[PDB]
Amino acid sequence: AFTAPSTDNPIRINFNENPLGMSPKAQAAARDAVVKANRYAKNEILMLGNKLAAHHQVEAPSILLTAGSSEGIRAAIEAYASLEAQLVIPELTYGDGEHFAKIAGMKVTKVKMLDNWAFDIEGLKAAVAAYSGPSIVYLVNPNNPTGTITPADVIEPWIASKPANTMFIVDEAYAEFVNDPRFRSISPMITQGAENIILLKTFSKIHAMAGMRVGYAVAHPTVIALMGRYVAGEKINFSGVDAALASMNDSAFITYSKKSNDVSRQILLKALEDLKLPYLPSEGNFVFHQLVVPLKDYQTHMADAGVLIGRAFPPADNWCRISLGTPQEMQWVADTMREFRKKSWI
Amino acid sequence: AFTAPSTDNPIRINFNENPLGMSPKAQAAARDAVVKANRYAKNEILMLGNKLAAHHQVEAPSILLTAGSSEGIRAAIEAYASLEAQLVIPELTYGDGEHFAKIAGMKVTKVKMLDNWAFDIEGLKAAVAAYSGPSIVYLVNPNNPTGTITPADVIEPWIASKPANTMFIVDEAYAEFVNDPRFRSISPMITQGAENIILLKTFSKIHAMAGMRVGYAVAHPTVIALMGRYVAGEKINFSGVDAALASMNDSAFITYSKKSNDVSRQILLKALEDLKLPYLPSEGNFVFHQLVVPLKDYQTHMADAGVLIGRAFPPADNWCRISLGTPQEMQWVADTMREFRKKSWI
Numbered sequence: 001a002f003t004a005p006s007t008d009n010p011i012r013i014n015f016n017e018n019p020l021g022m023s024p025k026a027q028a029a030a031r032d033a034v035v036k037a038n039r040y041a042k043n044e045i046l047m048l049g050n051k052l053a054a055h056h057q058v059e060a061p062s063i064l065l066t067a068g069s070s071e072g073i074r075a076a077i078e079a080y081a082s083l084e085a086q087l088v089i090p091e092l093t094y095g096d097g098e099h100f101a102k103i104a105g106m107k108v109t110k111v112k113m114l115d116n117w118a119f120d121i122e123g124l125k126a127a128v129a130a131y132s133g134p135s136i137v138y139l140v141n142p143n144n145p146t147g148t149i150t151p152a153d154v155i156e157p158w159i160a161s162k163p164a165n166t167m168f169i170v171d172e173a174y175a176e177f178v179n180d181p182r183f184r185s186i187s188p189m190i191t192q193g194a195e196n197i198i199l200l201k202t203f204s205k206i207h208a209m210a211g212m213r214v215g216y217a218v219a220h221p222t223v224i225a226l227m228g229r230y231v232a233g234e235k236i237n238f239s240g241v242d243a244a245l246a247s248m249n250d251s252a253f254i255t256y257s258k259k260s261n262d263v264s265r266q267i268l269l270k271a272l273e274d275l276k277l278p279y280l281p282s283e284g285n286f287v288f289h290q291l292v293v294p295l296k297d298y299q300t301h302m303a304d305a306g307v308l309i310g311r312a313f314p315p316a317d318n319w320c321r322i323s324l325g326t327p328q329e330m331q332w333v334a335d336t337m338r339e340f341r342k343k344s345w346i
Numbered sequence: 347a348f349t350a351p352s353t354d355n356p357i358r359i360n361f362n363e364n365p366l367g368m369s370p371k372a373q374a375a376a377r378d379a380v381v382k383a384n385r386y387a388k389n390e391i392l393m394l395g396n397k398l399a400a401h402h403q404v405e406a407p408s409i410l411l412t413a414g415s416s417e418g419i420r421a422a423i424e425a426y427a428s429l430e431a432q433l434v435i436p437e438l439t440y441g442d443g444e445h446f447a448k449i450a451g452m453k454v455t456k457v458k459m460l461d462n463w464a465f466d467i468e469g470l471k472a473a474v475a476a477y478s479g480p481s482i483v484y485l486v487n488p489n490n491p492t493g494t495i496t497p498a499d500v501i502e503p504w505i506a507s508k509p510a511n512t513m514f515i516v517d518e519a520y521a522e523f524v525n526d527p528r529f530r531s532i533s534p535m536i537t538q539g540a541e542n543i544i545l546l547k548t549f550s551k552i553h554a555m556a557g558m559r560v561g562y563a564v565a566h567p568t569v570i571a572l573m574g575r576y577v578a579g580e581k582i583n584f585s586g587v588d589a590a591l592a593s594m595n596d597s598a599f600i601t602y603s604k605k606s607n608d609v610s611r612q613i614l615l616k617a618l619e620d621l622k623l624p625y626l627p628s629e630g631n632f633v634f635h636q637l638v639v640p641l642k643d644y645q646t647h648m649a650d651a652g653v654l655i656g657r658a659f660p661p662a663d664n665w666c667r668i669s670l671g672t673p674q675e676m677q678w679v680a681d682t683m684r685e686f687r688k689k690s691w692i
């Protein structure tokens with residue numbers, strides 16, 4: 001069941017973790033792997049790479065397994081970094097791209113969001129076109145923290161035009177949650193031979209395995225080979241490898257994982273409509289919504305009430321990112337929000 | 347319970363893995379983490395960092411947790427690499443240093459082994475002293491593949507002399523197996539404030555957790571801060587983090603892990619002595635010995651008998667590295683070797 005939270009046992013809706021346990025088949029695989037984990041998972045890593053390759057309709061050399069997509073982002077940046085290069089990003093997006101770009105001494109070119117917190121793709125395209133050196137473009141889709149998608153018919157033709165000296169990193173961490181039919185995975189462009197795309201994926205979100213540390217990149221083999229020089233081989237942990245292989249066969253859990261996230265979303269959105277607090281469309285496992293009280297006060301009052309929400313995401317200073325917990329959790333949070341309103345805490 | 351091997355179920359003495367399961371307490375920790383691993387192991391990683399800091403008598407900023415020491419070697423090299431830097435290594439050692447040095451575009455300066463396969467420390471010192479640019483020195487102790495130690499009184503005064511523009515990476519993967527009293531961990535030099543040493547350690551060997559991917563670096567905080575820019579945070583897998591925390595408390599297992607290794611070593615050494623095949627002193631969980639037949643023939647005959655031994659380690663072309671299995675495995679291997687001798691296969 002669900003139990004009312006306290007500060008010692010809070011509802012955790014702070015890091016976009018799946019509030020469900022991983023698949024029972026994946027859990028069995030993970031636990032069974034422990035007795036084997038005195039040894040390296042060498043053959044199993046080969047099997048997982050092959051299975052991911054078939055999933056993306058590419059060959060094995062187009063897959064790089066990494067310890068989460070955290071490592072894929074780093075390797076992608078390191079592989080294509082130089083002191084002449086720029087990273088082109090929307091101003092409000094997932095911070096790892098900029099983090100590793102600054103480590104590489106790159107220019108970071110942030111493009112202001114449009115008036116609906118959408119990506120300004122014309123602005124991103126102009127940031128690349130007017131720069132005479134190499135550009136890395138980092139596109140998170142669906143975006144964190146906003147939750148919104150960028151339509152495929154807006155991204156795909158830009159990428160297909162092959163702007164000179166430009167590598168696109170497309171992070172689809174939250175893609176399996178998506179309901180909007182304008183969203184398409186970029187994967188088929190790689191299957192069809194694109195050499196200017198790195199697709200990053202993870203088992204941390206829909207597969208509910210954040211702590212297991214399994215992600216990967218999909219790209220042309222020449223791109224994967226370059227990225228491979230910035231990781232210490234493919235040496236994923238035994239439990240994560242076996243859990244990943246199992247989760248890939250448990251299509252029933254993946255349907256359930258999406259459906260539970262959909263139910264949670266509507267419970268939150270109901271409360272937000274009742275309170276008349278604007279929110280952005282949610283295509284991941286989180287909602288980004290507006291506040292009329294100071295963010296810091298709201299975070300503190302929620303924390304005292306046993307609920308950990310998202311950190312601040314400047315420059316959206318009056319917005320908060322609320323991850324979607326289980327339905328029972330989101331109802332308790334929705335109702336706390338209603339009680340806050342009565343006393344002006346929201 | 348021991349059973350005779352087949353080609354489908356071989357004795358695996360090829361990758362210096364501990365042939366013992368992980369500690370029973372560590373396995374239970376690892377299994378119990380799986381239900382929790384929908385979430386990132388954030389606080390648990392902080393606790394493991396603090397526990398390793400206490401173990402090495404340093405503060406937490408002097409520890410960097412990594413996904414095995416493989417990632418530590420990479421990060422250490424990336425942090426200190428430049429196009430003007432050289433890597434100084436013994437000609438016969440663990441190849442990851444050279445590998446990442448080459449990716450960085452560094453000169454790689456290999457110093458021939460002494461006539462007893464020991465490190466030529468005077469040659470390594472001279473290679474640094476002769477080079478006007480920055481140098482990284484990578485010292486594996488006990489060395490892989492030879493298994494030998496370099497006495498502390500030969501290494502410590504070199505490091506303590508602070509050669510200009512030189513960082514020492516000291517890889518003590520196998521150090522808990524060591525019996526030789528001339529061996530000393532470099533750790534106290536970091537506790538005493540050295541800024542030119544990176545110590546790398548792993549849970550993959552004495553702790554028997556190769557497949558759990560947990561290692562770490564110990565260094566001055568300024569050096570750890572630089573290394574940390576080349577990993578995607580400290581985001582170790584949940585089962586590994588909880589297994590590492592438990593294994594650090596199970597001192598009885600560590601004692602047993604070494605003792606079993608010692609027993610296995612003597613079984614192999616007894617066979618080599620009977621066969622009059624020279625070997626090097628073994629201070630890790632493997633033995634480097636000479637062959638009179640071609641290495642490739644010997645590798646093939648052992649594979650066919652269901653025993654997987656080490657790969658070739660040029661330039662020691664007439665030597666093989668045999669990992670130490672359980673005592674019962676090594677008795678069976680030892681007797682297979684005696685039988686091979688009768689038919690000239692060894």
Ligand SMILES: Cc1ncc(COP(=O)(O)O)c(C=O)c1O
Nearest residue numbers: 068069070094144173202204215
């Ligand atoms: C867009 C995005 N990409 C990548 C990551 C990194 O996740 P992981 O290393 O668990 O795959 C996250 C954070 O969870 C994310 O939100």
Ligand SMILES: Cc1ncc(COP(=O)(O)O)c(C=O)c1O
Nearest residue numbers: 414415416440490519548550561
């Ligand atoms: C000397 C040495 N250092 C480092 C490693 C890397 O091991 P891990 O990544 O499991 O810590 C090895 C394993 O082969 C090794 O032999």
